[PDB]
Structures are given as structure tokens and as C-alpha cells.
Design an enzyme around this catalytic site. Structure first.
Site, PDB file in Angstrom:
ATOM      1  N   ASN A   1      -7.272 -20.200  -9.943  1.00 48.57           N
ATOM      2  CA  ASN A   1      -8.596 -19.602  -9.908  1.00 48.57           C
ATOM      3  C   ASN A   1      -8.512 -18.150  -9.495  1.00 48.57           C
ATOM      4  O   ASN A   1      -9.296 -17.294  -9.952  1.00 48.57           O
ATOM      5  CB  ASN A   1      -9.561 -20.384  -8.972  1.00 48.57           C
ATOM      6  CG  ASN A   1     -10.993 -19.872  -8.984  1.00 48.57           C
ATOM      7  OD1 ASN A   1     -11.419 -18.955  -8.224  1.00 48.57           O
ATOM      8  ND2 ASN A   1     -11.752 -20.315  -9.955  1.00 48.57           N
TER       9      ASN A   1
ATOM     10  N   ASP B   1      -6.380   6.537  -5.175  1.00 47.51           N
ATOM     11  CA  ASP B   1      -5.865   5.193  -5.280  1.00 47.51           C
ATOM     12  C   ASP B   1      -5.921   4.710  -6.725  1.00 47.51           C
ATOM     13  O   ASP B   1      -6.216   5.546  -7.568  1.00 47.51           O
ATOM     14  CB  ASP B   1      -6.577   4.307  -4.286  1.00 47.51           C
ATOM     15  CG  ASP B   1      -7.933   3.946  -4.767  1.00 47.51           C
ATOM     16  OD1 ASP B   1      -8.438   4.268  -5.830  1.00 47.51           O
ATOM     17  OD2 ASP B   1      -8.507   3.208  -3.869  1.00 47.51           O
TER      18      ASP B   1
ATOM     19  N   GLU C   1       0.788  -1.222   0.000  1.00 45.98           N
ATOM     20  CA  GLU C   1       0.000   0.000   0.000  1.00 45.98           C
ATOM     21  C   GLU C   1       0.808   1.253   0.000  1.00 45.98           C
ATOM     22  O   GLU C   1       0.275   2.265  -0.376  1.00 45.98           O
ATOM     23  CB  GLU C   1      -0.953   0.135   1.250  1.00 45.98           C
ATOM     24  CG  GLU C   1      -1.983  -0.995   1.362  1.00 45.98           C
ATOM     25  CD  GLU C   1      -3.010  -0.860   0.262  1.00 45.98           C
ATOM     26  OE1 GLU C   1      -3.137   0.121  -0.437  1.00 45.98           O
ATOM     27  OE2 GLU C   1      -3.640  -1.954   0.011  1.00 45.98           O
TER      28      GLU C   1
END
Ligand SMILES: [Cl-]
Ligand SMILES: [Cl-]
Ligand SMILES: [Xe]
EC number: 3.2.1.17
Length: 162
Positions: A132, A20, A11
Site C-alpha cells: 500500500n 530540495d 537527506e
């Protein structure tokens, strides 16, 4: 390495309101302030969060205070979620951090919808899960981050973070 250090890496730290990757007003260590395009709104949310008139600027401590609150909320969200909890409790320490990271990023809800991966994870089918997981908007929108998290989940080690 730990959850805190891991998300501080994913972050970053910014002492001024910023947008962001989605274009949303954020501050500190990935602390979302608003989905609203209004900077004033964002500044209003910041002042509320901090308890003072920040003028859209906060200290390092302030930022780490919000971070801690956010990391705490992410785990409590997991423990309260019927779909999340059992997965989490089935995992080892490193893989639990990967899960917390996703929830920090996408919210309880977002993650509770990765039904298929969540199942493979519970079965300890690392590889399939990993595959996945990559089939998602998440991976295509922030792939380097997604790769790091996924490799963590897949392997159970912090190698992606060295
Ligand atoms: Cl807050
Ligand atoms: Cl990324
Ligand atoms: Xe997952």
C-alpha cells in the site's frame, strides 16, 4: 544504526542554501526553510532560524543543531497526533524509526493521511502495508528513498541501510 544516522543518509548534509527535490529552498540536513521561490525570503528564514546573519551559509554544528530540533519535533508531532500515536506506540524500535523518517519528510499531516497503511501497520500486516505504501506519489517521486523506508517498515531491520 539509529534515526539520526538513518535520516543523515536519506537527506545528506549541505552547508549552503539548496533546492530540495520539490524545488524548495533547504539547508543542512533536510531542513526546509521556505516553499517560497524567493531566495531572500529563504535567507531571511535562515537568519531567523540561526539567530545571526548567515548570508545563506552555516556551519556543520549549526546544521546538526537544526537537525536535532527537527528530529525532536517530528517525534513530538507523532506523540501529539491522535492518528499517529497509537500506531507508533504499537511498533518495535526499528519500525518506529521508519515512521519518524516519513514524518520528517512529509510532515504529520501528510503521514496521518496514509490511513490504509497505518491500519495494516497496526495489525502487523507487513507485506500488505509495504505494498500500500508504494502506491503513493511519495514512492513515485523519491523511489530509492521510499524503498529504503518501506523495506525497513516491512522487515523491522536496518538492512536497507547497510
Ligand atoms: Cl527553526
Ligand atoms: Cl530517492
Ligand atoms: Xe505507515
Amino acid at each position: 544504526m539509529n534515526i539520526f544516522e538513518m535520516l543523515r543518509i536519506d537527506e545528506g548534509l549541505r552547508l549552503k542554501i539548496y533546492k530540495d527535490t520539490e524545488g524548495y529552498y533547504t539547508i543542512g540536513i533536510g531542513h526546509l526553510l521556505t516553499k517560497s521561490p524567493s531566495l531572500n525570503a529563504a535567507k531571511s528564514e535562515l537568519d531567523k532560524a540561526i539567530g545571526r546573519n548567515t548570508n545563506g551559509v552555516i556551519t556543520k554544528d549549526e546544521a546538526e543543531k537544526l537537525f536535532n530540533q527537527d528530529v525532536d519535533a517530528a517525534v513530538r508531532g507523532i506523540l501529539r497526533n491522535a492518528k499517529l500515536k497509537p500506531v507508533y506506540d504499537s511498533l518495535d524500535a526499528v519500525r518506529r524509526a521508519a515512521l519518524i523518517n516519513m514524518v520528517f519528510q512529509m510532515g504529520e499531516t501528510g503521514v496521518a493521511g496514509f490511513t490504509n497503511s497505518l491500519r495494516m501497520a497496526q495489525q502487523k500486516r507487513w507485506d500488505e502495508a509495504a505494498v500500500n505504501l508504494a502506491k503513493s506519489r511519495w514512492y513515485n517521486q523519491t523511489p530509492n528513498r521510499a524503498k529504503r523506508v518501506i523495506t525497513t517498515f516491512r522487515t523491522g531491520t536496518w538492512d536497507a541501510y547497510k
